[PDB]
Amino acid sequence: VGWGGSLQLVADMIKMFFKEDWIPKFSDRVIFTLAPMIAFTSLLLAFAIVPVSPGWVVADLNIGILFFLMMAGLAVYAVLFAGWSSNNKYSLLGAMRASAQTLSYEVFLGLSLMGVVAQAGSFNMTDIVNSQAHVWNVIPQFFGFITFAIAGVAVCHRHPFDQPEAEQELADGYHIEYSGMKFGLFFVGEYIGIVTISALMVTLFFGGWQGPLLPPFIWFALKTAFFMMMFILIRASLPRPRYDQVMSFGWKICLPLTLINLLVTAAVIL
Amino acid sequence: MEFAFYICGLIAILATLRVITHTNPVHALLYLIISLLAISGVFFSLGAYFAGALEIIVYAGAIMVLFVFVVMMLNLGGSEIEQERQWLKPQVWIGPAILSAIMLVVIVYAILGVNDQGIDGTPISAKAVGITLFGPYVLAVELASMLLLAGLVVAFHVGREERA
Amino acid sequence: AFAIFLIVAIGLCCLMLVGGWFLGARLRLSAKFYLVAMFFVIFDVEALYLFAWSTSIRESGWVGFVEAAIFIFVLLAGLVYLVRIGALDWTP
Amino acid sequence: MIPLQHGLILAAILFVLGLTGLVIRRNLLFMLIGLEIMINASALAFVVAGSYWGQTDGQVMYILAISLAAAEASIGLALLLQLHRRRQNLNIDSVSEMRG
Amino acid sequence: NDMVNWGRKNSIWPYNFGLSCCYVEMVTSFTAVHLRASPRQADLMVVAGTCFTKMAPVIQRLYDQMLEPKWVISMGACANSGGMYDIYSVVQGVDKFIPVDVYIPGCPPRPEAYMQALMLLQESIGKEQGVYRANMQSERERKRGERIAVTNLRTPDEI
Amino acid sequence: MTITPQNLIALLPLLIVGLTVVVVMLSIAWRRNHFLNATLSVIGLNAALVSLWFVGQAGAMDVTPLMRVDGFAMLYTGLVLLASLATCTFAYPWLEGYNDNKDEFYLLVLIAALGGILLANANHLASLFLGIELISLPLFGLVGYAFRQKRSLEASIKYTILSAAASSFLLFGMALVYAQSGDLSFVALGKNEPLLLAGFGLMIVGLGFKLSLVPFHLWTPDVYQGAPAPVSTFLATASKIAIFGVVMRLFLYAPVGDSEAIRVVLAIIAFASIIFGNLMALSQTNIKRLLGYSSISHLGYLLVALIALQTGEMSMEAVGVYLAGYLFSSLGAFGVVSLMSSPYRGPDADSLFSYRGLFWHRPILAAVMTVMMLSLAGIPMTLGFIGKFYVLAVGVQAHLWWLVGAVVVGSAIGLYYYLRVAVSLYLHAPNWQYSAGGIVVLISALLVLVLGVWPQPLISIVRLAMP
Ligand code: SF4
């Protein structure tokens, strides 16, 4: 039997290849093609700002944080042009409610990231990875860390669980009208999304490239693997939350939490 | 630098021409997003590092999303197509096109009169706008927050909800 | 650099898409109530000032924390206003 | 190595194109779209002016200009909401009363 | 290389069309083996339950919607044939109007039968419909000498 | 520079009003009551008038590079505050008959007062922009308040697109000047190449929309017919009063305004504003469109003084007193129009043919409209005549013969429609805060009469304020 966890996803990709493509009638054609890469390329290029090595850095640009927020905001357009390209009021309203809770729960990550970039004081990722040299920026900011966790898992990572189905009748999940390679493109996109959120979390919250007794790149890789397993553990443990309860625990509870979080970090940093 | 600036400026020009020539709205929204991305590329090429990435997060990531919401919810595609193309003929496009072209040639003649004094792509970091925003310019920020409260209340008012 | 990685990514996109091709009116009560998203459109603009703020705070100091507290207090007053009037509530 | 004239004429071209889009079309959505285009053109002109002199004068009012754009687009979109809620016709000639 | 064949054996997407009865055992199986199954995304359709003349067009539209590589598992006597309902209102088997690949007798079959259905279907999927001049061997003929050699069974007065 | 207590005492008008918005917004979210919100908003604006005395204890000084606080700005803040006080007292009787959400009105007027008292204090081109837009957003939204009619929404949408268009012209002009000059500060500007002048012309377009000048006046009829009469009190008086201060300060400080290239263009706009106002104003039979037509001519008389600001120092007090007289005349006239709509009444039916009688219906209120309507024209015993007299003197002082002749012939043409409305209130006939609204317009009637017959005390205040 197959011994590797990734080989199942590999076979899934093989399966999506060589499948006949049908044209949709009474549909727009340019967005039907362009909507997959708005979901894929965003979290693909979210990987372009990680300091995997000082000598093998993929991009030595001055700002990486703002690019990450730009991808966070950009992701919504994939659910919107997918909703309009569904060309069925059912599916369109399903994607409208999915984009609703998406825009609703994407607010928190930037304000949660303000704490770590304020105690770091720079946008160049070399400064952040050199800041976590002895003390990581997770001990004081527990609330900011969990708020960024909720926000990162809330951006189309399936934790809300309103993507392929709809609690509300008169509408339907928006993953139905795509059946060619685009559905595999969606899955591989969320896969690079979860691994890139984990990598950004480890290299921005915890200390990357430390190397206590072993070479630091495999130290980063193993820590990323532990956070991968913990993310999968809590994603599976996380039950489906209906639309209402998600709206209830959104703007009410965590906007004050992040505002007092910014107050606490600004009071303690000086 | 020169070839990149020329090609992204021409991309912006072509996207601006495309958004003002088509009829279907969603194509126009896509081409306007392309134009905004080109403008952010111009901002990064000039050296305004805190502008190209600031435009996308807010100007091309929330407000245009609101435009997409309203054009999606009206469901105006599939209805009222023929008469808009009937009325918007090239002949009535020429009318104000030359009137705006007089303005264009006047501002080109005004701007070509000065010397060049060319500036390189100087990089401006966020460390100094964090001071200049907080130097003389604090009351601008405070009154802008009050401005945003004003926008919130006038949008709540004139977008009043009801039973329907 | 970033340009090389972008060229690689767009070349991979062209390779996958080309390979894929070779392989072979009235809404009534429905929708509406996007005003949570309009609240986001305004609140992202409010938080962009904190986006610019987060880079330089050590040289700002006590008046900076004071008027940042005033700013977020104004935002909090607006938020509780929208909550208490019934604008920010259950939405379809 | 690009001087100011190229960027300023680019901003002027986008300004003119946004004004033309504000003029020629009938749908209020399209006038708001051209309005936002021409606001962005003016903001581009301001940003190139601010970064021309090589100090931090371009990012100081650009944020507030896009704040104005956000508020104006929001009130305009709510006006479109209530206009289409009142009357199904979305032409500007429906609201063309008090002529002369 | 046969890598393409390996891809389809390793991973399959099931579309559960179990009807009024016979689906409680299928659910018993599915909740142990496995919101992922979606219309127009699956390549496997496990038709269970009695196929009726009135609702047969529904099954024909769902059969038409799926992609070019189509697999169908009939489970139960009510889906293989008309089963016990040889009546004016029941069509005598889902195989009358859609091709079927695997037949799982029983009324209702067991979850282990569903497991053996996936095993016989990956076996057919790994030989390329999958005849390949290897499927003439039949479960009636393969385990025949296994079944005939059974002599003693437990008396039915015990648990 | 940093914050000193001198800066806070100087900023006290912008502060009391901002604290009022917060308290009003908290009060709206707490109770959503009309009486409490009206009381809280009027108390804050009255507290801003009281604190004008305290900034008078402070001298002529800067707060930031954005603003300069002089005694000139003290008077302009006062004009804007009484207009805000005037509009809330006229809105309570109109909004008592409104069906729902009757409490957002004072919040928007308070934002507009912040915008008005920010254009009084100006020293940098950016403060000019933070002020224009702070006042427009309530004027974006308050002409669309009570959108249940078919014309309020119409008026709001026409003003919305056009005001955003003017702001985009102002911003593009604001940068094209800063390309030449190293700073956008008014004083630092101009330190006559065509790009600076070309940038200046774009700011004239973006400023002359809100000041209702001759090729931009098309909005002033329509929204004045469409908007509620309480909004028209603020839209006629406060906005243009606040806006005229910043456009005068730019030409006083900037050395580019000294050059004759901009001077000739503004004079022709002023010439045509008087003419293209006072000729199309005759045929109107609607009172709101009639006042909107007169507004174009009044801002034209202000411009014929402003062109001769640079010749003789009497133009400072001339602009100031005509603004004071123009405030009182329009507040009394627009208050009577709003006071006729004592309930909401849906669409108010106001017209020149609808104002037959009105002396045997309500005699006191007809007297106020007549006194103010004669004050708009140039009839003596009214403060408008003294304001008219200084602008004639300023034009004589600077030898602008075509411009002063335009005022006289514009006065000669414009006498006609003011007099019809004055006599049409004498043909044959076809709650507590309402008494308060009557008191405001009656108080203004007494003031314009006593400052027309006896105008010295107002001049003493103006020369006290001018630097
Ligand atoms: S096979 Fe058995 S359980 Fe299934 S539908 Fe037929 S009778 Fe019912």
Gap between the Cα atoms of B159 and D78, Å rounded: 5
Chain D residues in contact with C49 (beta carbon < 8 A): 63
Gap between the Cα atoms of B8 and E59, Å rounded: 53
Residue E104 lies in a domain: yes
Is the sign of the CA dihedral F26, F31, F37, F40 positive or negative?
Answer: negative
What is the 3-state secondary structure of chain F?
CCCCHHHHHHCHHHHHHHHHHHHHHHHHHHCCCHHHHHHHHHHHHHHHHHHHHHHHHCCCEECCCCCEECHHHHHHHHHHHHHHHHHHHHHHHHHCCCCCCCCHHHHHHHHHHHHHHHHCCCCEHHHHHHHHHHHHHHHHHCCCCCCCCCCHHHHHHHHHHHHHHHHHHHHHHHHHHHCCCCCCECCCCCCCCHHHHHHHHHHHHHHHCCCCCHHHCCHHHHHHHHCCHHHHHHHHHHHHHHHHHHHHHHHHHCHHHHCHHHHHHHHHHHHHHHHHHHCCCCCCCCHHHHHHHHHHHHHHHHHHHHCCCCCCCHHHHHHHHHHHHHHHHHHHHHHHHHHHCCCCCCCCCCCCCCCCCCCCCCHHHHHHHHHHHHHHHCCCCCHHHHHHHHHHHHHHHCCCHHHHHHHHHHHHHHHHHHHHHHHHCCCCCCCHHHHHHHHHHHHHHHHHHHHHHCCHHHHHHHHHHCC
Gap between the Cα atoms of F291 and F373, Å rounded: 10
Q: Is C45 an interface residue toward B (CB < 8 Å)?
A: yes
AA letter at D72: E
Chain E residues in contact with A15 (beta carbon < 8 A): 7-8, 11, 43
Q: Which of E16, E17, E50, E104 to mutate to test the pocket of ligand 1 (most atoms within 8 A of CB)?
A: E50
Instruction: Give the CATH number of the domain where residue E64 resides.
Output: 3.40.50.12280
DSSP assignment of B9-47 equals HHHHHHHHHHHTT-SSHHHHHHHHHHHHHHHHHHHHHHT
CB count within 10 Å of CB A204 equals 25
Tokens found for residue A46: 């979210």
* Cβ F322 vs Cβ F389: under 8 Å: no
Domain total in chain E: 1
Q: Give the strand pairing for F61-62 and F68-69.
A: antiparallel
* Cβ F153 vs Cβ F146: under 8 Å: no
Q: Find the helix or strand (DSSP H, E) in which A199 lies.
A: helix A181-204
Q: Which residue has 């205040």 as its token pair?
A: F461
Crossing angle between the packed helical segments F363-377 and F383-397, to the nearest 10 degrees: 10
- DSSP SS3 for C35: helix
Gap between the Cα atoms of E13 and A211, Å rounded: 43
- DSSP SS3 for E72: strand
Gap between the Cα atoms of F308 and F303, Å rounded: 9
Find chains touching chain F: ≥3 CB pairs under 8 Å: B, C, D
Beta bridge partners of E46: E16, E73
Gap between the Cα atoms of B130 and B112, Å rounded: 35
Gap between the Cα atoms of E69 and E44, Å rounded: 9
Gap between the Cα atoms of F245 and F238, Å rounded: 11
* Cβ E74 vs Cβ E100: under 8 Å: yes
Nearest by Cα to F93 from F339, F439, F366: F339
Report CA F175 to chain centroid distance, whole Å: 27
Domain that holds residue E6: 1-149
CB contact under 8 A, E36 and A11: no
Beta bridge partners of A264: none
Residue E96 lies in a domain: yes
Tokens found for residue D92: 């500007």
* Cβ F273 vs Cβ F214: under 8 Å: yes
Map out the domains of chain F as residue ranges. Answer: 1-467
Instruction: Give the distance from residue C45's alpha carbon to the nearest chain D alpha carbon, in angstroms.
Output: 6
Q: Find the helix or strand (DSSP H, E) in which E47 lies.
A: strand E44-48
Nearest by Cα to A230 from A188, A201, A263: A201
Phi, psi of B77 (to 5 degrees): -75, 140
Nearest by Cα to A246 from A176, A150, A142, A110: A150
Phi, psi of E103 (to 5 degrees): -120, 130
Is the sign of the CA dihedral B15, B17, B19, B21 positive or negative?
Answer: negative
Nearest by Cα to E75 from E22, E21, E29: E22
Nearest by Cα to F91 from F226, F200, F227: F227
CB contact under 8 A, D74 and C48: no
Gap between the Cα atoms of D26 and D37, Å rounded: 16
Phi, psi of B131 (to 5 degrees): -95, -45
Give residues preceding each break in chain F, C–N over 2.5 A.
Answer: 191, 430
Tokens found for residue F265: 């263009």
Helix segments in chain E, DSSP class H: 3-10, 23-33, 56-65, 77-80, 111-125, 139-142, 144-148
Nearest by Cα to A106 from A146, A153, A63, A145: A153
* Rg (alpha carbons) of chain C, rounded to whole number: 23
> From the CA of E84, how far away is ligand 1's center (Å)?
9
* Cβ E58 vs Cβ E87: under 8 Å: no
- DSSP SS3 for B152: helix
- Write the residue in D3, D30, D44 that is nearest to B118 by C-beta: D3
Phi, psi of F69 (to 5 degrees): -105, 115
Q: Which of E19, E74, E78 to mutate to test the pocket of ligand 1 (most atoms within 8 A of CB)?
A: E78
CB contact under 8 A, D79 and F141: no
* Cβ B143 vs Cβ F114: under 8 Å: yes
Instruction: Check residue E96 and report its DSSP letter.
Output: G
Phi, psi of A23 (to 5 degrees): -85, 135
Tokens found for residue D70: 């956000």
* Cβ E11 vs Cβ A8: under 8 Å: yes
Beta bridge partners of E102: E73
Q: B141-144: which pairs have CB atoms within 8 A and are 24 or more residues apart? A: B141/C49, B141/C67, B141/C71, B142/C67, B142/C70, B142/C71, B142/F18, B143/F14, B143/F114, B143/F118, B143/F130, B143/F134, B144/C49, B144/D63, B144/D64, B144/D67, B144/F130
Phi, psi of F384 (to 5 degrees): -65, -30
CB contact under 8 A, D78 and C49: no
Gap between the Cα atoms of A66 and B56, Å rounded: 9
Nearest by Cα to A231 from A162, A150, A160: A150
Tokens found for residue F228: 């509620």
Gap between the Cα atoms of B144 and D43, Å rounded: 16
Beta bridge partners of E71: E44
Gap between the Cα atoms of F316 and F306, Å rounded: 8
Query: A17-35 b/e with 16+ CB inside 10 Å = b?
Result: ebbeeeeeeeebeebbebb
Q: How was this structure determined?
A: cryo-EM
Phi, psi of E9 (to 5 degrees): -70, -45
Nearest by Cα to D17 from E67, A189, B97: B97
Give helix then strand counts, H and E, for chain C.
3, 0
CA distances (Å), B65 to each of B19, C91, F219, F240, F272, in order? 17, 18, 31, 35, 44
Gap between the Cα atoms of F46 and B76, Å rounded: 50
The HSE-up count of residue E94 (CA atoms within 13 Å, CB side) is 33
Instruction: Check residue B58 and report its DSSP letter.
Output: I
Instruction: Check residue A46 and report its DSSP letter.
Output: G
* Cβ A186 vs Cβ A197: under 8 Å: no
Instruction: Check residue E16 and report its DSSP letter.
Output: E
Cis ω for the linkage preceding E39 (within 30 of 0)? no
Phi, psi of D58 (to 5 degrees): -100, -30
Is CATH 1.20.58.1610 correct for C1-91?
A: yes
Nearest by Cα to F326 from F303, F353, F305, F299: F299
- DSSP SS3 for E45: strand
- DSSP SS3 for D56: coil
Map out the domains of chain C as residue ranges. Answer: 1-91
Q: What is the largest CA-CA distance in chain C?
A: 65
